[PDB]
Amino acid sequence: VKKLINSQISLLIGKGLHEFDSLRDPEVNDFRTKMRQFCEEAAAHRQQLGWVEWLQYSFPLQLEPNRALLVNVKFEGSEESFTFQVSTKDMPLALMACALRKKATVFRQQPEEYALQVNGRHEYLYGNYPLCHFQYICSCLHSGLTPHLTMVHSSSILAMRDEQSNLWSLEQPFSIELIEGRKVNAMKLVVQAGLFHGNEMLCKTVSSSEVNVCPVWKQRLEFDISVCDLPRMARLCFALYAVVDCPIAWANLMLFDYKDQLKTGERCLYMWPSVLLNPAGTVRGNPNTESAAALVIYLPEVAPVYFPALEKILELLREILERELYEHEKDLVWKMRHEVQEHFPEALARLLLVTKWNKHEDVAQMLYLLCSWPELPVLSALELLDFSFPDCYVGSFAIKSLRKLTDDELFQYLLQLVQVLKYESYLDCELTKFLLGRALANRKIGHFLFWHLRSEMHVPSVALRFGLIMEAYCRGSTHHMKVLMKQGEALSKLKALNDFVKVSSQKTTKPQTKEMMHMCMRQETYMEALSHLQSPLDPSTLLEEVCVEQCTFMDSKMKPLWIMYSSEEAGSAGNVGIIFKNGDDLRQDMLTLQMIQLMDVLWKQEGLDLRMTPYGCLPTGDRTGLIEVVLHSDTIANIQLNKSNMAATAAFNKDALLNWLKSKNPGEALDRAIEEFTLSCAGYCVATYVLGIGDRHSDNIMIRESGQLFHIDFGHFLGNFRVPFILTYDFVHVIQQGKTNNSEKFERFRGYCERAYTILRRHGLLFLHLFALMRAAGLPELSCSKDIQYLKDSLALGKTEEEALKHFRVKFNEALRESW
Numbered sequence: 001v002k003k004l005i006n007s008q009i010s011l012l013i014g015k016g017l018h019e020f021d022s023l024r025d026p027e028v029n030d031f032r033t034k035m036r037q038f039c040e041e042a043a044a045h046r047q048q049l050g051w052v053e054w055l056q057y058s059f060p061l062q063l064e065p066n067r068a069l070l071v072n073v074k075f076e077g078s079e080e081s082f083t084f085q086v087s088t089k090d091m092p093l094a095l096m097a098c099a100l101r102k103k104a105t106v107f108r109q110q111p112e113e114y115a116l117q118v119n120g121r122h123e124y125l126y127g128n129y130p131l132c133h134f135q136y137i138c139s140c141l142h143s144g145l146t147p148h149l150t151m152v153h154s155s156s157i158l159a160m161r162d163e164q165s166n167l168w169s170l171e172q173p174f175s176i177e178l179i180e181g182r183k184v185n186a187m188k189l190v191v192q193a194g195l196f197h198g199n200e201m202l203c204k205t206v207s208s209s210e211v212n213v214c215p216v217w218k219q220r221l222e223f224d225i226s227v228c229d230l231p232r233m234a235r236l237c238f239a240l241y242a243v244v245d246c247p248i249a250w251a252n253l254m255l256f257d258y259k260d261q262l263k264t265g266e267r268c269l270y271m272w273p274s275v276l277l278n279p280a281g282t283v284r285g286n287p288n289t290e291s292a293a294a295l296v297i298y299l300p301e302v303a304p305v306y307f308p309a310l311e312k313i314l315e316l317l318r319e320i321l322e323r324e325l326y327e328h329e330k331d332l333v334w335k336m337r338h339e340v341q342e343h344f345p346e347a348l349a350r351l352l353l354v355t356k357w358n359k360h361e362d363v364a365q366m367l368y369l370l371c372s373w374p375e376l377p378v379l380s381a382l383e384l385l386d387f388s389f390p391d392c393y394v395g396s397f398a399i400k401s402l403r404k405l406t407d408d409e410l411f412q413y414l415l416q417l418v419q420v421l422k423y424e425s426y427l428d429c430e431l432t433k434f435l436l437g438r439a440l441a442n443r444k445i446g447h448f449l450f451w452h453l454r455s456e457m458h459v460p461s462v463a464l465r466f467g468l469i470m471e472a473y474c475r476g477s478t479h480h481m482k483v484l485m486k487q488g489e490a491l492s493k494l495k496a497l498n499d500f501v502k503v504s505s506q507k508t509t510k511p512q513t514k515e516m517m518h519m520c521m522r523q524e525t526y527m528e529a530l531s532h533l534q535s536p537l538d539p540s541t542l543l544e545e546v547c548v549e550q551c552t553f554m555d556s557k558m559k560p561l562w563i564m565y566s567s568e569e570a571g572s573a574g575n576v577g578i579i580f581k582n583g584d585d586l587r588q589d590m591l592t593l594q595m596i597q598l599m600d601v602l603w604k605q606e607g608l609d610l611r612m613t614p615y616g617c618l619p620t621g622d623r624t625g626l627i628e629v630v631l632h633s634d635t636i637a638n639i640q641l642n643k644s645n646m647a648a649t650a651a652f653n654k655d656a657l658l659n660w661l662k663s664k665n666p667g668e669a670l671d672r673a674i675e676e677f678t679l680s681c682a683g684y685c686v687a688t689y690v691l692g693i694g695d696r697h698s699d700n701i702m703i704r705e706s707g708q709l710f711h712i713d714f715g716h717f718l719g720n721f722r723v724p725f726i727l728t729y730d731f732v733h734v735i736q737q738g739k740t741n742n743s744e745k746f747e748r749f750r751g752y753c754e755r756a757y758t759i760l761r762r763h764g765l766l767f768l769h770l771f772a773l774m775r776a777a778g779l780p781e782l783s784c785s786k787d788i789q790y791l792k793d794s795l796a797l798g799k800t801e802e803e804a805l806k807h808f809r810v811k812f813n814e815a816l817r818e819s820w
């Protein structure tokens with residue numbers, strides 16, 4: 001039992017638990033015991049939660065950021081149902097009462113004892129909220145479907161819960177002895193060092209002696225800083241390069257250990273290959289000890305030297321610049337530090353960037369203001385998670401301020417918070433305890449936290465950390481671990497199936513490959529593995545019976561698979577699909593879609609539903625991911641091919657899109673699809689201009705039969721190949737309802753673009769903090785300031801609301817003139 005769980009975690013996280021112990025590292029050993037225990041206490045509090053609190057954990061509510069409707073209600077142990085004509089202003093409790101009365105009259109004889117489960121879904125409807133505030137109700141009111149819900153009693157939810165149980169006295173200057181190395185190159189070799197407190201130097205970059213390629217130095221490198229004035233998060237960074245410039249390898253390390261003690265004596269640093277100095281990189285050596293260039297160095301003794309505790313630390317024209325600053329302006333902010341705490345608390349980030357981290361008296365002065373610093377908003381707190389604020393007490397404060405994050409806000413920023421783990425100096429950190437804690441209190445946070453870490457297990461710089469966090473998570477969730485093993489089981493099968501489709505497509509016809517994909521899919525093991533799991537894209541979505549005849553593959557380079565599902569219990573809402581792609585990095589796609597989804601949230605909060613399609617996209621492994629099938633859609637390209645004996649047969653290529661809409665929306669149903677198209681077009685015109693989505697062509701823009709426009713293939717963003725605003729004649733034609741001149745519908749569409757644009761600019765900083773935290777990912781198109789800059793200009797964040805609107809009008813007008 002205890003052994004099987006250990007072998008289950010190993011297979012699931014894709015790294016044997018025997019490997020962690022084989023390193024014999026006390027830090028890895030300390031994190032494992034402490035986090036195992038932390039996660040087991042969370043598991044314990046959970047198994048005692050009330051039945052409603054278990055619904056908030058296992059099935060958290062999907063809420064939207066009057067008018068009549070038909071709803072179908074049945075009960076758990078019967079096929080018998082009742083269809084009611086209720087209102088969007090009614091709470092679930094009233095519908096639950098109607099359902100219990102209709103039961104009493106059929107069965108010839110309390111609502112607070114039930115929850116409404118969404119049929120064939122891991123979704124529920126409970127709490128004091130009108131029906132239209134629920135995502136499932138809106139997805140029914142929009143598509144034209146009748147919600148199907150089952151009355152689940154308190155005892156059946158409790159049965160689920162139960163079945164799912166488990167110092168200053170050192171004034172000398174800092175120095176190291178650079179002994180030798182064991183690398184490969186073909187010239188002389190120089191080892192440049194540097195002391196860093198995040199993205200900033202504590203002193204200048206002291207270089208080494210030019211020793212020949214054949215390498216021994218044995219030099220005492222002296223740094224321009226004192227041993228008493230080393231910050232706790234001091235980072236000694238190295239770089240090895242060849243000269244007659246060519247980078248070879250880099251390596252970083254902390255001067256204090258996880259137990260706050262200054263390190264001694266000999267250190268062999270297994271270096272990471274280079275693409276000058278890299279302070280942002282991992283402080284753990286390359287795990288490929290056999291094929292890695294190593295650097296031996298000495299950490300001289302100073303006699304145990306522990307970093308002082310907080311009790312010792314604690315004992316030891318201004319308004320015009322508060323909206324990069326000069327050396328005199330910095331001195332002003334630092335002298336005024338007490339006034340900044342009391343009258344400008346949100347300016348904290350600017351005060352943290354002016355304190356001299358190269359002087360221990362200055363740090364304690366800053367930290368004294370910080371320990372009495374009032375709580376900052378979520379927006380201020382997301383800025384302090386950057387590697388630009390590396391201090392542990394700053395990070396602890398940032399986490400403290402982020403504790404007020406709702407489960408909806410935390411879920412929206414989970415990708416950025418997972419990325420910040422790459423910046424952490426030590427294994428046991430506040431961020432992990434916060435993620436793991438918040439994961440174990442919410443199965444949906446826990447699901448996605450797992451997939452974010454699992455997706456990168458093949459990346460050796462994070463493999464140890466990500467694997468230890470997943471192991472700690474499984475300790476606190478034995479049932480979920482098995483639920484996620486089922487998802488990896490389907491994915492292991494989709495990878496072997498896709499490898500066959502790849503080989504087969506280069507040897508035979510598509511109908512021949514398709515038929516054999518079906519014969520392989522219909523094998524016992526494939527039928528079991530691909531059916532009856534939760535969707536890695538959405539835990540609330542249940543992938544029940546796999547529809548083998550409806551499955552195929554797409555013709556693009558990597559032969560993506562088209563896997564269809566159906567569920568008897570769910571009805572039409574159970575007809576779902578996933579696209580399995582293997583070969584491309586899907587990280588940037590996920591980020592771009594999450595940023596569009598965030599835009600849709602900020603628009604919906606202000607009462608604007610621009611009819612957006614934020615379809616799921618999730619990396620699951622090495623160059624492997626899933627995309628969500630948006631049902632009843634097709635590319636602009638396909639529609640425009642204009643084939644004969646079809647309902648979309650056009651006399652002119654321009655009419656193809658409008659004829660396609662007419663054929664799918666007959667009669668009075670057409671006018672709504674023109675509005676759907678107009679709103680979605682405006683939202684994607686803003687999203688693509690703001691995010692710099694270039695290289696747009698008819699085969700990467702899609703339309704739903706409902707009229708809704710949306711983009712696919714986000715392989716390029718932030719201007720990478722200054723992208724101008726885009727307007728296609730083929731779309732303006734549809735907005736104008738097939739008229740040459742129609743300004744009434746064009747200006748209302750221009751209004752949508754203007755309104756959408758302004759709303760985004762007000763949260764411009766939120767996109768700025770989130771994209772800055774994202775630099776930790778290693779996306780080749782999100783690597784520097786020139787990438788974050790594109791967003792600063794696209795949103796004209798410097799300018800006022802009226803100045804930016806005119807600048808946008810020039811961008812919107814230049815797109816219209818470019819439209820043939």
Ligand SMILES: Cn1nc(-c2cnc(N)c(-c3cnn(C(N)=O)c3)n2)nc1C1(c2ccccc2)CC1
Binds near residue numbers: 554556630631712713
């Ligand atoms: C009908 N239909 N629906 C889609 C569809 C639906 N939802 C999506 N999210 C995406 C998507 C997103 N990214 N992406 C990608 N990178 O490839 C694809 N595509 N595609 C088709 C087509 C198809 C399907 C199967 C076999 C041949 C041709 C006609 C192309």
